[PDB]
């Protein structure tokens, strides 16, 4: 059975995780884990309560690891237990993946040094201090590393993983079974397509978080420099 | 505060619910409820454990009600307590919505009689016996009823709801904050675009479920005829 693991942490953006989870859990001969320091409840940033299924110590060796984003990323970037677990699993995983600001956690773990990567548009300036080559594309692959932008990036890249782990017909069948054919009613999902007034509002609302994450990123980078 | 409620039932397809939940929970002055017979754990069809936040009896009057789909729809189509709750809330709700096979629950509750509606492609033949006018479109509106197809239909129609409950700029801001701009790597999300061999495999895998749901639908229709 292919072993797929998602990191589940307090203040996660739950859709970053629950999207790819439901897609990948539809595949045959896959076991999906929700990993935290111990099994039990973990509260997402919206208040939705999820349940971790395994601890770091009990998690099997993973074929795919996926790091979601969310408000809670800031704490995770300075959590030595979580970062050590990610490094351990990434050493042998076939795919190391992240959604949105989850790539900042990969960066804090040292796994983006010299690698092309993306992250959420409002935090993109934090990639270079973590050693990455920043790329403004929705899905960026570099070897076995996949980083994606958008709350549903993991749905799309889960179909790519399905095709590579199994075959294209299997990925197509899952897509059809889920009737997955999105059609957003607005075209404001990128700072390059949204109205300038909307971009301003979104930037202003992220400013305090960006300021705090600049400070955290510099401390994380100092640890990588040691 | 706008009151938004999702029905959370055993064997729900969790992404049908968790997608719109995360979008709508991003809006100001919204309270989101996960409703079942009592608060506590409810297991989705993948094994993911969610937590209902309120009972039928304690749920406030809702402005938006949303019925997700999943394997568990068959039991819900003959659950008189759940159907009565849906009818009660639908009487005063500004929007009555469903994702995928959730529209079959609205049908069993009598809320599709004479109404245009859609559902998952493999179960679409079950709409007419429930009194609906079947429509093969991804989102179908009839008055205050919205039915959508696809595991992520609720993400897209949540942006429409945001624009109507608030304004277009608010919906655009949420879309940008979530960097929501999907781009599936395959084009097999409809029986009209997938390869014929894939459609066959998907149809065969749904056949037992369709057979069981034909039986349930006929009993539900008999209750509506009384």
In terms of DSSP H, where are the helices of B57-195? 73-76, 80-92, 102-108, 153-165, 168-177
Do A21 and B152 lie within an 8 Å CB cutoff?
no
Choose among A19, A41, A139: nearest Cβ to B15.
Answer: A19
Residues B177 and A7: their CA atoms lie apart, in Å, by 22
Residues A224 and A42: their CA atoms lie apart, in Å, by 29
Contact in structure between A104 and A132 (CB atoms under 8 Å): no
Residues in chain B after which the chain is broken, C→N over 2.5 Å: none
Of the residues A100, A104, A155, A162, which is catalytic? A100
Tokens of B198: 């894939």
Q: Are strands A95-99 and A30-36 parallel, antiparallel or unpaired?
A: unpaired
3-state DSSP assignment of residue B42: strand
Show residues of chain B in contact with A13, CB under 8 Å.
22
Residues A108 and A131: their CA atoms lie apart, in Å, by 9
Of the residues B12, B32, B100, B105, which is catalytic? B100
Choose among B152, B169, B195: nearest Cβ to A152.
Answer: B152
Measured in angstroms, the resolution is 1.1
Active-site residue A100, yes or no? Answer: yes
Smallest CA–CA distance, residue B225 to chain A, in Å, is: 31
Residues B32 and B35: their CA atoms lie apart, in Å, by 10
Q: Please report the DSSP string for A99-168 in residue order.
A: ETTHHHHHHHTTTTTT-EE---GGGGGGSGGGT-EE--SSEEEETTEEEE-STTHHHHHHHHHHHHHS-H
- The answer for B6, left when phi > 0, alpha when psi is -120 to 50, beta otherwise, is beta
Tokens of B150: 């696809």
**Among B179, B178, B199, which Cα is nearest to B188's?**
B199
Smallest CA–CA distance, residue A219 to chain B, in Å, is: 26
- Taken in order A197, B181, A82, A142, the sign of the CA dihedral is negative
How many domains does one find in chain B?
A: 1
Residues B141 and B134: their CA atoms lie apart, in Å, by 12
Domain range for A92 is 1-226
């Amino acid at each position: 059975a292919v072993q797929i693991g998602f990191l589940l942490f307090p203040e996660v953006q739950q859709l970053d995780l629950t999207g790819p989870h439901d897609v990948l859990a539809s595949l045959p001969d896959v076991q999906v884990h929700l990993i935290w320091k111990e099994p039990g409840p973990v509260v997402a940033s919206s208040g939705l309560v999820l349940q971790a299924t395994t601890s770091f110590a009990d998690c099997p060796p993973l074929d795919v690891i996926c790091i979601p984003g969310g408000t809670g990323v800031g704490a995770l970037m300075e959590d030595p237990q979580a970062l050590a677990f990610i490094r351990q699993q990434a050493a042998r995983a076939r795919y190391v993946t992240s959604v949105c600001t989850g790539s900042l956690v990969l960066g804090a773990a040292g796994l983006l040094q010299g690698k092309r990567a993306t992250t959420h548009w409002a935090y993109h300036e934090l990639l270079a201090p973590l050693g990455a080559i920043p790329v403004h594309e929705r899905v960026v692959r570099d070897g076995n590393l996949l980083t994606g932008t958008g709350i549903t990036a993991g749905i799309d890249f889960a179909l790519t993983l399905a095709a590579e782990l199994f075959d294209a017909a299997t990925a197509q069948r899952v897509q059809l079974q889920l009737e997955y054919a999105p059609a957003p009613p607005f075209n404001a999902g990128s700072p390059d397509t949204a109205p300038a007034s909307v971009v301003q509002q979104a930037r202003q609302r992220a400013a305090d978080s960006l300021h705090k994450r600049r400070e955290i990123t510099l401390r994380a980078a100092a640890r990588l420099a040691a």
